[PDB]
């Protein structure tokens, strides 16, 4: 089984500048190794097809490169409608595969997330049910972590985020993690707090409240 | 013009059957290899299976191979895919691709989405994520609502029946380990505006008829 790997699995690039990303093949497939763009819940699109060859129809910024296990995509000047997942596949051997793909998105200044915590409501509490909301707004570069920590413990497994897509307007991500507890887990601890590490801050950043 | 369109997507209990089509326009389908792609929430593309112009050869991926058959009618301009022994692995938007001389996918549909999960029909408790001094930051307060425990997918949002649009998240939702869907939706606003505007979360879905509209006080 032919395997493609894509390097990097993330990049930010600055309009009108050049950006070029990589596809590695397993084995020699030569030139039968094709590009597409996908941008989020939309269709796929052919970009470069056996290589190097422009597809009718891609913006002339658009070129590949590359032979036997070493492929290249370049956007020459990047424009803002380039942010996308970028995949390789090959059609040199039978099973077909694609790569794991290339995210790249609008760079843009660093912005630290604005960080809240929400307790459960009284309404969800009465059914039984204990939902702790950490909300992480606008922040760039998408890359974010959230630790939940009940009285100074350090929680795992009991938690699931969410991230929106880049915003067309400023270029930020924004970042939503739920702690589920049950009423009885929830009423035998004191403090509530998530701890949020990002690259615009220096130390990272807790918010916490007392449930009772 | 060249135009893939697939259906026949929807939810389907794990182990039972369902069958996908592709209605091929603007070219001749005996013409061209045919293939499926399909992309699982948060996962990248995934081949799953090939079929050459006349139908008389077929290739599977390892993840599919046994449980799936691509089939083919020329004179309907149709590709199927008959799904046998669903896993909930097998949750995705699959994809029908046009073949170019078995080299580049040409051409792509618009998808149709497949939900494998033995969950029923579930219409969502919506709960008040609610502002305050904890939710203020830099002359701007958070609020929302918690849009949990509905099946299956979409919800749809809105702030003060659409007028409310500025500083409104909608994060996609996710998937929790009961096989419900959760999502949340937050809103900025100044914080002065806290207990002289009113603020309601206008929550529909479709799958289930079910309308909530909630209150979301300081």
């Known amino acids: 089984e032919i395997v493609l790997t894509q390097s990097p699995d993330f990049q930010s690039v600055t309009p009108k500048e050049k950006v070029t990303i990589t596809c590695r093949a397993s084995?020699?497939?030569?030139?039968?190794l094709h590009w597409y763009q996908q941008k989020p819940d939309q269709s796929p699109k052919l970009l470069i097809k056996?290589?190097?060859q422009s597809f009718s129809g891609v913006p002339s910024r658009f070129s590949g490169s590359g032979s036997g296990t070493d492929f290249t995509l370049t956007i020459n000047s990047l424009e803002a409608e380039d942010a996308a997942a970028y995949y390789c596949?090959?059609?040199?051997?039978?099973?077909?595969?694609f790569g794991p793909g290339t995210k790249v998105d609008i760079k843009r200044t660093v912005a630290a997330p604005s960080v809240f915590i929400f307790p459960p409501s009284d309404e969800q509490l009465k059914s039984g049910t204990a939902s702790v909301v950490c909300l992480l707004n606008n922040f760039y570069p998408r890359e974010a972590k959230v630790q939940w920590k009940v009285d100074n413990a350090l929680q795992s497994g009991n938690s699931q985020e969410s991230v929106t897509e880049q915003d067309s307007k400023d270029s930020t991500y924004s970042l939503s993690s739920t702690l589920t507890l049950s009423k009885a887990d929830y009423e035998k601890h004191k403090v509530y707090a998530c701890e949020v590490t990002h690259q615009g801050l220096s130390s990272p950043v807790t918010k916490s409240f007392n449930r009772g | 013009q060249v135009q893939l369109v697939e259906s026949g997507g929807g939810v389907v209990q794990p182990g039972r059957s369902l069958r996908l089509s592709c209605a091929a326009s603007?070219?001749?389908?005996?013409?061209?290899?045919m293939n499926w792609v399909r992309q699982a929430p948060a996962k990248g593309l995934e081949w799953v299976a090939i079929?050459?112009?006349?139908?008389?050869?077929?290739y599977y991926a390892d993840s599919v191979k046994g449980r799936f058959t691509i089939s083919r009618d020329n004179s309907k301009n149709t590709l199927y895919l008959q799904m046998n022994g669903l896993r909930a692995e097998d949750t995705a938007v699959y994809y029908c691709?046009?073949?170019?001389?078995?080299?580049?996918?040409?051409?792509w549909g618009q998808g149709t989405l497949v939900t494998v999960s033995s969950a029923s029909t579930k219409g969502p408790s919506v709960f008040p994520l609610a502002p305050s001094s904890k939710s203020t930051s830099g002359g701007t307060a958070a609020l929302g609502c918690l849009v949990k425990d509905y099946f299956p997918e979409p919800v749809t949002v809105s702030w003060n029946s659409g007028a409310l649009t500025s500083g409104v998240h909608t994060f996609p939702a996710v998937l929790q380990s009961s096989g419900l869907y959760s999502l949340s939706s937050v809103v900025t606003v100044p914080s002065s505006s806290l207990g002289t505007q009113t603020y309601i979360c206008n929550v529909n879905h479709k799958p289930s008829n079910t309308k909530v509209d909630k209150r979301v006080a300081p």
């Open positions: 691709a046009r073949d170019l001389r078995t080299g580049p996918f040409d051409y």
């Open positions: 603007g070219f001749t389908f005996s013409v061209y290899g």
């Open positions: 079929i050459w112009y006349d139908g008389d050869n077929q």
């Open positions: 084995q020699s497939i030569g030139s039968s």
């Open positions: 056996y290589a190097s």
């Open positions: 596949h090959q059609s040199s051997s039978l099973p077909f595969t």
